[PDB]
């Protein structure tokens, strides 16, 4: 078994960092002057957790980790080859380059799910 550790694959190649995806999710939750400090932090924890979980829910995924969708890769989103990415780059690098167009993709991945559900049922 390969267990580099929490965030241990932040500097490894993105393909190699796909191998460790359960460790980061595990420790994300980690379930009177000091009291207000501690409590405030402990609320922002569950809020930061439930925002990303909410998104992962309304994209139809709901299922933890890698999830596919039928959205086409608009090549203008940093056009490189696949071997040019998953054998080379790291996730910080990657999300930096994609950071510009990220929000648009989050918006698109919203709407397509819904129609699927709707007419899927019916």
């Amino acid at each position, epitope marked *: 078994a390969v267990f580099l550790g929490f965030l241990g694959a932040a500097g490894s*190649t993105m393909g*190699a960092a796909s191998m460790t995806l359960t460790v980061q999710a595990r420790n994300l939750l980690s379930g009177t002057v000091w009291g207000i400090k501690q409590l405030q932090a402990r609320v922002l924890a569950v809020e930061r957790y439930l925002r990303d979980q909410q998104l992962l829910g309304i994209w139809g995924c709901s299922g933890k980790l890698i999830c596919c969708t039928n959205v086409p890769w608009n090549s203008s989103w940093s056009n490189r080859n696949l*071997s040019e990415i998953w*054998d*080379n780059m790291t996730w*910080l690098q990657w999300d930096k380059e994609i950071s510009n167009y990220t929000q648009i993709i989050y918006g698109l991945l919203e709407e397509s799910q819904n129609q699927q559900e709707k007419n899927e049922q019916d």
Partner: nanobody
Amino acid sequence: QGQLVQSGAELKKPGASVKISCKTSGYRFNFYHINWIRQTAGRGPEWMGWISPYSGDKNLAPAFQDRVIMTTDTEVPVTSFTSTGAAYMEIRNLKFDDTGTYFCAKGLLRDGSSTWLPYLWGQGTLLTVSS
């Protein structure tokens, strides 16, 4: 997207101090490998060896198995991704068939079955083996 610097070299007799250096810019110096190749007018383009700056693994050709030594230096960062290092090579047993320009060229990407294939090349340092 950065250019690799190659160090020009002295004419040399069949015995004299021999080394050529190579500098870097604009890339993460410890991911990509380092390949060395030498083009003479008598035997064509010949691959010599390669070495990784992160691990240090050199694989040489049997034609340079006992007369060439390769070296890498330590990385000096600039930003969170880019960096600046260097690497030398000392080819001993200077024969006359070694006369001719030669080069440095780093690997293409960090992982795969084609980790080290030389994508980014240098400028060119020229030898003249001559008494």
